[PDB]
Design brief:
Immunoglobulin-like fold, Thiol disulfide oxidoreductase, mainly beta, oxidoreductase, 59% strand, 4% helix, Immunoglobulin-like
Length: 111
Amino acid sequence: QFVPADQAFAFDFQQNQHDLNLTWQIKDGYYLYRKQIRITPEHAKIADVQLPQGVWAGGSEIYRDRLTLPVTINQASAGATLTVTYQGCADAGFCYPPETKTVPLSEVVAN
């Protein structure tokens, strides 16, 4: 029941200049918290990131199977980063501690 957090929530990204897509492979029986998701840019300029509508686990909006999030990078300095924090739980009644991924951004000039 306690599979590694990363096996339960496989994080990956892919950048095409201004286009950044963050993805989670969410294992069956597990889910992410919408409200717990946090995205913080360092030395980069990103658009307001809307979260998609999820299903509901008794009061809380949650994400299952997979979460796909487009992020638009308007500007990015060299060495810039996107810090991605999230938390997720198991239907079996426990939760993993919040996780942080440090996504390295490729440099992008504005406009």
